[PDB]
Structure 1
Amino acid sequence: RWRQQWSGPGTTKRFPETVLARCVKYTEIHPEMRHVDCQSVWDAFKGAFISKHPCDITEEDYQPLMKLGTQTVPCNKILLWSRIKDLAHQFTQVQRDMFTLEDTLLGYLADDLTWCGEFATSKINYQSCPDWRKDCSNNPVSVFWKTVSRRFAEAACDVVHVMLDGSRSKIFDKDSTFGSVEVHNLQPEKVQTLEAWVIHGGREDSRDLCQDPTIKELESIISKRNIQFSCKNIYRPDKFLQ
């Protein structure tokens, strides 16, 4: 017909199968979400982006999926992260009472996947999906992750932790979901402290990264939002205390 070709990779192959299997396994190992009808949430997920131009997806498109995947997690044991998902998921795996976004149903469903649809048809596009900088920044994956990260940050309370990679050029990057969505959606009425865990890395060059200019910038941001800021250098990543 008039198919749109994009500069980014297509939908992950076996995407419906993978999403349904992930939902099954999650409801298995997370009994607090056993009330979930997985076929219905997959229907909501696919209805979010099917038969819609991939560059005009909005948060409301994902609203039905957000309701079937509502998950009130203990708000005082939320672990945010940025650019160190390996170590963050290791921590939540060895200290199984704390949650990352990927430990919730929707994050576990969509983690490491790619998906988009077509405007003229109702089939999932497996050939290409929009590139964020070359095609369009608001696509099914972008809108989904922004929406879910906003709702996950808004649900946090008491002391909220964030894991950060100290080996990055920008330990705190404004152009990340944590910097562009999560820090701005922590509720001052529920959160009193954001605690950064700056994980150390780089064979040599291990000083006090809590004095890094990006950490001071994050501190001023969270302070202007009337939330206390906490920062702790982590020199070697011993989850073997845990």
Structure 2
Amino acid sequence: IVPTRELENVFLGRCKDYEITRYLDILPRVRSDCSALWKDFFKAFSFKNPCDLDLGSYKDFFTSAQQQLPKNKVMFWSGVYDEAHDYANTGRKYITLEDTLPGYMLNSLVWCGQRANPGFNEKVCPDFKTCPVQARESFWGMASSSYAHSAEGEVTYMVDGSNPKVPAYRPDSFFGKYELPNLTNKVTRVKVIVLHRLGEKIIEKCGAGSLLDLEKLVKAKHFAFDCVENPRAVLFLLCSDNPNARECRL
């Protein structure tokens, strides 16, 4: 597993590009400058064995980097990276974590500590599975927590309803572990979009299975809940990529 070349420059270049040119009208700028953000990000992991982290390690970084997020616009997703993002349309319809400053700066990057200079590795990172969960999930787990914790109003959750393996809702997923349970009383509703992949056996439906379980969690948290299976707007997006699928019939 190969860490990212010149992490600092990449970090700082994204940070700066975001700062001046990205999400201008969609999300707010952040107070701390880009060098400040690097220091907080890098103190979390540097000069330590790669597994030497926990859920607190990147705390300062997420405090510094948390943006206020617009009412009613925040989205969560499980198992449907590409569809949730095509449909969230780069901040235009919904915010996703990847549109936010920390999400955007670290999206897809790979990096790890080493005890010895220069304090991070530049040849190899260990397999996440080798590290305790709280080190494996230190970074994206707390990123999820901070994002969820800032949401207000309606939130939207896009799931996979077409996977026999992974059920739609799961306590053990990142939405299950860090997001749904960090939703504050500023949240008024969870609106689930169930994604049913085209030409594939339908697994989870609203009102059933894991989607029932979540309905119950959502209500137990004092939120309103709704759930829709392939709403026309999403359906269409799925249909541009497989136009002959029966589901897209004219």
For the superposition of Structure 1 and Structure 2, which TM-score range results when normalised by the shorter chain?
A: 0.7 to 0.9
Compared CA separation, residues 14 and 171, structure 1 to 2 (3 A): same
Paired residue type of 1:75:
K
Q: Give the TM-score normalised by structure 1.
A: 0.85
Tell me the CA shift for residue 218 of structure 1. 1.4
| Distance in 2, Cα, partners of 1:94 & 1:115 | 25
Compared CA separation, residues 226 and 83, structure 1 to 2 (3 A): same
Secondary structure at the counterpart of residue 36 of structure 2? helix
Q: Which residue of 1 aligns with 2:161?
A: 166
Alignment of 1:12-161 (within 5 A): 12-27=4-19, 28-31=21-24, 32-33=28-29, 35-93=31-89, 96-139=92-135, 142-161=137-156
* Residue 199 (str. 1) matches residue 195 (str. 2): yes
Q: Is the 8 A contact 1:82 1:163 kept in 2?
A: yes
Runs of 4+ in 1 over 4 A off after TM superposition: none
Equivalent of residue 3 in structure 2, options 7, 11, 15: 11
Q: Is the 8 A contact 2:154 2:187 kept in 1?
A: yes
C-alpha RMSD of the superposition: 2.3
| Distance in 2, Cα, partners of 1:214 & 1:14 | 42
Tell me the CA shift for residue 174 of structure 1. 2.4
| Distance in 1, Cα, partners of 2:216 & 2:208 | 13
Aligned pair count?
230
Q: Which residue of 1 aligns with 2:242?
A: none
Residues 71-124 of structure 1: CA deviation (Å, up to 9, x unaligned): 111132101111111112112226615211111100101111111111244432
Compared CA separation, residues 38 and 167, structure 1 to 2 (3 A): same
Compared CA separation, residues 49 and 94, structure 1 to 2 (3 A): closer
- The worse-fitting range, judged by mean Cα deviation, of 33-42 and 194-203 is 33-42
Using the aligned pairs only, state the percent identity: 30
Secondary structure at the counterpart of residue 228 of structure 2? strand
Q: Is the 8 A contact 1:130 1:136 kept in 2?
A: no
Compared CA separation, residues 94 and 40, structure 1 to 2 (3 A): closer
Q: Is the 8 A contact 2:50 2:112 kept in 1?
A: yes
Q: Is the 8 A contact 2:204 2:211 kept in 1?
A: no
Tell me the CA shift for residue 208 of structure 1. 6.9
Q: Which residue of 2 aligns with 1:4?
A: none
Secondary structure at the counterpart of residue 127 of structure 1? coil
| Distance in 1, Cα, partners of 2:102 & 2:94 | 16
Compared CA separation, residues 207 and 60, structure 1 to 2 (3 A): closer
Q: Which residue of 2 aligns with 1:186?
A: 183
Tell me the CA shift for residue 205 of structure 1. 2.6
Paired residue type of 1:237:
L
Q: Give the TM-score normalised by structure 2.
A: 0.82
Compared CA separation, residues 113 and 225, structure 1 to 2 (3 A): same
Tell me the CA shift for residue 34 of structure 1. 6.6
